Amino acid sequence: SGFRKMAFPSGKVEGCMVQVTCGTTTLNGLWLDDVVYCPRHVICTSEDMLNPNYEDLLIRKSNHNFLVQAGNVQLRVIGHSMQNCVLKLKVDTANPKTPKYKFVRIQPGQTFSVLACYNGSPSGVYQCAMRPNFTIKGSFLNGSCGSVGFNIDYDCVSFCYMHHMELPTGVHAGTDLEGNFYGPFVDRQTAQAAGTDTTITVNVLAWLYAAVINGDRWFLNRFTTTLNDFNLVAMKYNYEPLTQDHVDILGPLSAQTGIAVLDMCASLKELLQNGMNGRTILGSALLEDEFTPFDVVRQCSGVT
Amino acid sequence: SGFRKMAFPSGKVEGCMVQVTCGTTTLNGLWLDDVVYCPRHVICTSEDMLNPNYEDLLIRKSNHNFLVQAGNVQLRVIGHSMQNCVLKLKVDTANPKTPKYKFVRIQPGQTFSVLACYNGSPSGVYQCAMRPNFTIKGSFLNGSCGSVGFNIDYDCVSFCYMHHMELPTGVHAGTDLEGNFYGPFVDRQTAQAAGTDTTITVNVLAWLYAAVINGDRWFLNRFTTTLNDFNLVAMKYNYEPLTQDHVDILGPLSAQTGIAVLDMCASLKELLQNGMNGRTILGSALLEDEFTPFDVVRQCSGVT
Ligand SMILES: Cc1c(N)cncc1NC(=O)Cc1cccc(C#N)c1
Ligand SMILES: Cc1c(N)cncc1NC(=O)Cc1cccc(C#N)c1
């Protein structure tokens, strides 16, 4: 019992972190096999960030200009290429600590762990969701660029995020491991609009199921609703419309608790319309949307 | 910017986790140098837990009855001893992955990371506080016993907690690494009272400073208070009385923000008396007490 915002164990990712320096800019890199991946803006000075021509900036660089240091050990760079917004530095040594891994592009609303790093050194690990507007509400300071987000399936690390930028609003933007930004963002020092965000409805319902499993049941009521009726309420409260695909992935939690998905929707409808009334659910005074149905099942069954 | 409930990177601790089996009971063990530490209740059956005589139960066990497996590798047990509520199994092989470490007994109100484990395998990492009543509100299932709590100071892991028990209330109890329980608990299947808990005042003030640093400032007011006046409010709202020792450790945050500690106390006084008014602070709709002043400074400066 108990329910926490749990991150994956970060050990497999810690073994991959390196420091990358190009000129006067230092950030983090991810060393997997014989390649180091890092944000391409490592090649920019602060002046370059206003309107960078990355192709021209990279042409002024040679392999020997990319200094890669794995803690104490120096890597020899034998190739460099830019793919979208990431640089791939080929090194002459495969990382002996490379875990089994995949590169995945996650969907908005999915969750992942971030290993925040500075100068190639891990500082902390936290769990977060990719917002529906493709930003993440992380905890990142200058030097955190190159820190990665990931999920783990037994012994396989699926890397899904590389940190690039903090928007003027204090929220964060980054790319998949092929260097494609999540959302409309570009790697430039220009104010950029993140879309209107919404609350991840299926995750709030998953978390209400986690609450019932752990004994927090006060919000359960005598009501039911329909997808159409619930979606009128979701619209009013800026929640994602619930679909049958979301109801389908909530099936295991509905089966475990015996609470039909639309009956849990009626509890969520009442909480949106009435608020919490000064009460808490799983130690929170607001509706939590950073746990997917898969996370709730994993945490409630003890998967390693 | 951004502020998250961040855990320490768990890699150094993952390398120490092993599975310990004695008879039909399996739990987690911590392998440091040539010793494996685990809860002594690994020697009990479910029937034994009602009123165990651990000395007599341990006398029926030999070194060869303790099966220790480090993932895939089997450890040879060459000695066993009970120290308070932990067993120490001497093995013939020093853990090659032993980090620099210390055993510390933390104070109530301090925070630490927990690496939740099952069958010797890490499942997740989360940050929590030791409550003033010496319980922790963790996320633990059957088989999680032996999971540890820790802090990290550069390359040194300070182990402070080993998980032993879930109280009938769903909160958690455990020991330091010398096997002494935190709080009044005993390792027996008997209902046990955890003391009245309080809110960790110095941590709420540290978190209000973290909020101002990150731009959440709506709660700042034109008022000030005294320690005596603030403590009358703390008493009414079940908060720990604030002392000059707490004001002293808040000095770096007061200096960074220019907000005198007693002026922040007046903001906290107004929030206790008026509530949040439907607003949030750092994404929370309640007053958060799981960040110490040291955690806020570490997170706000990027320490690795
Ligand atoms: C300063 C900072 C913080 N606090 C957190 N995270 C990141 C940063 N760094 C930056 O955003 C620096 C920067 C500037 C312009 C474009 C890009 C890109 N791509 C990157
Ligand atoms: C079942 C469980 C969960 N959910 C989380 N954490 C732990 C458990 N295990 C137990 O509490 C089993 C137990 C029983 C009686 C005394 C002691 C001790 N010491 C340990």
Curated annotation (Swiss-Prot), chains A, B:
Changing residue 49 to A: Does not affect ability to cleave and inactivate human TRMT1. It is found in: Host cytoplasm; Host Golgi apparatus; Host nucleus. Residues 1-304 are cytoplasmic. Changing residue 132 to H: In strain: Omicron/BA.1, Omicron/BA.2, Omicron/BA.2.12.1, Omicron/BA.2.75, Omicron/BA.4, Omicron/BA.5, Omicron/BQ.1.1, Omicron/XBB.1.5, Omicron/EG.5.1. It catalyses: TSAVLQ-|-SGFRK-NH2 and SGVTFQ-|-GKFKK the two peptides corresponding to the two self-cleavage sites of the SARS 3C-like proteinase are the two most reactive peptide substrates. The enzyme exhibits a strong preference for substrates containing Gln at P1 position and Leu at P2 position. The active site is at 41 (for 3cl-pro activity), 145 (nucleophile). This is 3C-like proteinase nsp5. It comes from Severe acute respiratory syndrome coronavirus 2.
